[PDB]
C-alpha cells in the first residue's frame, strides 16, 4: 500500500510544482516591464535556471509516479 | 526611498523561496519513505533502478533549482543596495 501511496504522493507533488512554476514564471516576467539593468538581467537568468530545475523535478516525479502506478507488481 | 518596484521584486523572490522550500521539504519526505523500501529490500533490481534514476534526476534538478534561486536573491539584493 506504501507503493500506491508514494505513486499518489509523487503525482500530487508534480501537479503542484507545475502550477507553482507556471505561476512564478508569470510573476517573474512581470517584473521586467519596469526592472532594467545588470541585476534584472542576472535575476532573469537565475529564474531561467530555477524553472529549468523545476521542470526536471516535475518530469522525474511524473515518471516515477507512473512507473509505480502502472508497474506496481515489480515494486 | 524604497520604491514599489523594489518591494514587488522582493515579494516575487519571497514566493520563489517559498516554492524552493516546498519542493525540498516534499522531495525529502518522498526520499525518506522510498529509501526505507530500498533498504528493506522490498524494492530491488529493476524497481530500485527506477527509483534510483528518478531520484538522481530530481536531486540534480533540486540543486539547479537552489542555485537559480541564489542568483535571483543576489540580484534582488543588488537592486536593494546590498552589494
Residue numbers in the entry:
A (entry chain A): 2 to 76
B (entry chain B): 8 to 90
Q: Which text from the study accompanies this structure?
A:
Using this expression approach we expressed and purified six Esx complexes and determined the crystal structures of M. abscessus EsxEF (EsxEFma), encoded by the MAB_3112 and MAB_3113 genes, M. smegmatis EsxGH (EsxGHms), encoded by the MSMEG_0620 and MSMEG_0621 genes, and M. tuberculosis EsxOP (EsxOPmt), encoded by the Rv2346c and Rv2347c genes, at resolutions of 1.96 Å, 2.70 Å, and 2.55 Å, respectively. Three additional Esx complexes (EsxGHma, EsxEFma, and EsxTUma) from M. abscessus, a fast-growing pathogen, were cloned into pMAPLe4, an expression vector similar to pMAPLe3 with the exception that the MBP moiety is cleaved from the CFP-10 passenger by TVMV protease leaving a TEV protease cleavable His6 tag on the N-terminus of the CFP-10 subunit. The substitution of an N-terminal cleavable tag on the CFP-10 subunit in lieu of the C-terminal His6 tag on the ESAT-6 subunit was deemed to be more amenable to generating a well ordered crystal lattice as the number of potentially disordered amino acid residues is reduced. A crude low resolution model of the SeMet-labeled EsxEFma complex was used to obtain a molecular replacement solution for a high resolution (1.96 Å) EsxEFma native dataset and a second crystal form of EsxOPmt, solved by molecular replacement using the EsxOPmt model from form I, at 2.55 Å was also obtained. The asymmetric units for the EsxEFma crystal forms have a single complex in the asymmetric unit for the SeMet-labeled protein and six complexes in the asymmetric unit of the native protein crystal form while the EsxGHms and EsxOPmt (both crystal forms) contain two heterodimeric complexes. The WXG-containing loops are well ordered in the EsxGHms complexes and in most of the EsxEFma complexes but the majority of the connecting loops are disordered in the EsxOPmt subunit structures.
Of particular interest are the Esx complexes which are dimers of two subunits (ESAT-6, early secreted antigen of 6 kDa; and CFP-10, culture filtrate protein of 10 kDa) and which are secreted across the cytoplasmic membrane by Type VII secretion (T7S) systems. Mycobacterial ESX secretion systems have been shown to be involved in a variety of physiological processes including conjugation in a non-pathogenic mycobacterium, iron and/or zinc acquisition by both pathogenic and non-pathogenic mycobacterial species, and virulence of pathogenic mycobacteria. The overall architecture of the complexes is similar to known Esx structures in that each heterodimer forms a four helix bundle with the CFP-10 and ESAT-6 subunit homologs each contributing an α-helical hairpin to the complex. The subunit interfaces in the four-helix bundles of the Esx complexes are similar to those of the previously determined Esx complex structures in that the intermolecular interface between the CFP-10 and ESAT-6 subunits is largely hydrophobic.
